[PDB]
């Protein structure tokens, strides 16, 4: 346009997005786990009440 | 004089413009510009209406224009031309100001800023017409433009939200024109109207905006319902894409109304009950909403009579709806007391009133339901009663005539009896006491499924406002 090599950096955005959404799969890892952690603490709640 | 008044409308708008504008060029924040846009419309109606009618043309000169000033002049020209204090240096508030685009920066080269401002401007046109109460030529002209404008460009998340209201105005004006007066043209534009919205729903699926999709479905559904095409509406709703994600409670009220109504004539009354009972409560309860609310109340009772159940006499009495709920009360009473002669006089007498609210086609079907109530009473009151006595009571023609009524009725389980042909009577089979039966378990399980639904429904929604509110900064 007025500043060229606007078709190398357009594709760097794309490249970065495929990385980042894998690191929000690291929050979907965590999501199963916070279900199995509260599950465990509900168990140890039983054991403390006992 | 005039100039003073124009500067004030422009100034008032600038504020409104800023609010939605600052957010959307940060990055889209979809929900928040939507809530502001609702408030914005209300303040703009008063602004436009008073302090002359040439303010819209002015507001245009203040922002950037490629062809925006030109388009707006033609609209104004129609309602008698305006261009006084509407040209740069007297409708120009910029002159090195950065919110309204720096003047140096505007002259100097390329990159557009036309997008959001163009879209916003269109909304103002719609509202401008609607306040005037002139549709005709101006509407047709405006209609043609804005449709190829939205599709020239490819919409943003925010830009979707503005057309979700824009379409509502194009839809509605055309419905009023079509219902004014019948022409060859009236038939032509109906075709165009359906085509554009239905394609635009395809696009809007992929852009991820629920609010555009939700409005479109309502409009499209209203269209089948008007023109009596049951057949077109049944396909639309079975090839679902309705969102429950991001809507208003306005939108759920419209949707649930159209669904109930459509289902009624096609002989399903049970799910329609769910839909219309649902619609009333979701709708905002107010005195400016009285039109939509009044239409729902009329439908709901009519739908109760179709089942063979009876809505309250208490209902028609304590309302402040009494004037309009004048026909329904007699329609219910006629069915409740099961006299067929009363029912015939009623539907004749209120024929004009009902036709408007278009429950008239349903009133014809209720004549079945009359008979049903009238034989229900007889069976309950006398357990064992000869068909002879039923003829005396309800003025049936013969023994046979009533025999056939019952015979058909008990297949559907309405009267819940069995006929004794040889002894000449009807012997009723209801006797209760199902605390010996295993019946309570199914009943109870349906109640426990409602209670389980309420359990899922709280759990998801509760934390959700909390998580956003914790994320945002606080002391």
């Amino acid at each position: 346009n007025n500043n060229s090599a606007l078709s190398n950096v357009n594709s760097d955005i794309y490249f970065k997005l495929k990385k980042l959404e894998k690191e929000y799969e690291l929050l979907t890892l965590q999501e199963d786990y916070i279900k199995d952690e509260q599950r465990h603490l509900k168990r140890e709640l039983k054991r403390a009440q006992e | 004089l005039h100039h003073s008044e124009k500067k004030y409308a422009e100034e008032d708008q600038v504020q409104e413009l800023l609010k939605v504008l600052n957010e959307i060029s940060k990055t889209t924040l979809t929900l928040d510009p939507r809530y502001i846009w609702r408030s914005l419309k209300d303040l703009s109606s008063l602004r436009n209406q008073e302090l002359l009618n040439a303010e819209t043309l002015c507001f245009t000169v203040n922002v950037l224009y490629p062809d925006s000033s030109s388009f707006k002049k033609n609209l104004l020209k129609f309602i008698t031309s305006n261009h006084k204090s509407s040209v740069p240096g007297s409708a120009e508030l910029r002159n090195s100001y950065p919110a309204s685009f720096y003047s140096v920066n505007t002259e100097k080269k390329t990159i557009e800023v036309t997008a959001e401002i163009n879209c916003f401007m269109h909304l103002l046109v719609q509202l401008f017409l609607w306040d005037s109460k002139e549709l005709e030529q101006l509407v047709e002209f405006n209609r043609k433009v804005v449709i190829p404008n939205l599709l020239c460009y490819y919409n943003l998340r925010s830009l979707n939200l503005i057309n979700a209201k824009l379409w509502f105005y194009i839809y509605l004006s055309h419905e009023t024109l079509a219902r004014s007066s019948e022409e060859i043209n009236s038939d032509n534009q109906n075709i165009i109207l359906r085509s554009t919205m239905m394609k635009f729903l395809k696009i809007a699926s992929l852009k991820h905006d629920n609010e555009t999709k939700a409005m479109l479905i309502n409009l499209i559904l209203r269209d089948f319902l008007n023109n009596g095409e049951v057949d077109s509406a049944s396909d639309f709703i079975s090839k679902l894409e309705y969102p429950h994600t991001d809507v208003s409670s306005s939108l759920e009220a419209r949707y649930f109304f159209y669904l109930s109504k459509i289902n009624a004539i096609q002989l399903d009354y049970s799910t329609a009950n769910e839909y219309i009972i649902a619609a009333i409560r979701k709708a905002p309860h107010n005195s400016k909403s009285l039109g939509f609310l009044q239409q729902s109340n009329k439908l709901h009772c009519c739908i109760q009579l179709l089942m063979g159940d009876i809505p309250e006499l208490s209902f028609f009495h304590q309302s402040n709806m009494q004037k309009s709920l004048l026909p329904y009360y007699h329609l219910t009473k006629a069915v409740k007391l099961g006299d067929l002669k009363k029912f015939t006089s009623t539907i004749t007498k209120y024929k004009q009133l009902l036709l408007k609210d278009d429950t008239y086609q349903l009133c014809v079907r209720l004549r079945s339901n009359v008979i049903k109530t009238g034989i229900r009473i007889i069976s309950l009151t006398y357990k064992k009663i000869s068909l002879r006595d039923i003829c005396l009571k309800l003025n049936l023609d013969s023994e046979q005539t009533v025999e056939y009524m019952v015979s058909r009725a008990i297949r559907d389980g309405v009267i819940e009896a069995k006929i004794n042909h040889e002894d000449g009577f009807i012997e009723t089979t209801e006797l209760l006491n199902i605390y010996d039966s295993e019946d309570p378990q199914q009943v109870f399980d349906e109640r426990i499924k409602f209670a389980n639904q309420l359990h899922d429904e709280y759990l998801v929604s509760m934390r959700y406002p909390e998580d956003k509110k914790t994320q945002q900064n606080e002391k």
């Binding site: 997005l17 979907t28 | 950037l64 390329t110 490819y154 991820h208």
Partner: protein
Amino acid sequence: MTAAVTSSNIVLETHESGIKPYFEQKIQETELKIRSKTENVRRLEAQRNAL
């Protein structure tokens, strides 16, 4: 630089650039998904923080 007199990109990269949100359609459908995941992973964190 800004205007609308002069069309962006000197009108040669608006239809050879509209084959590009389809490359990116896969990631933005999935981005939408992610926004409900974020809400959920603190949702159940609150329950276990109280617990």
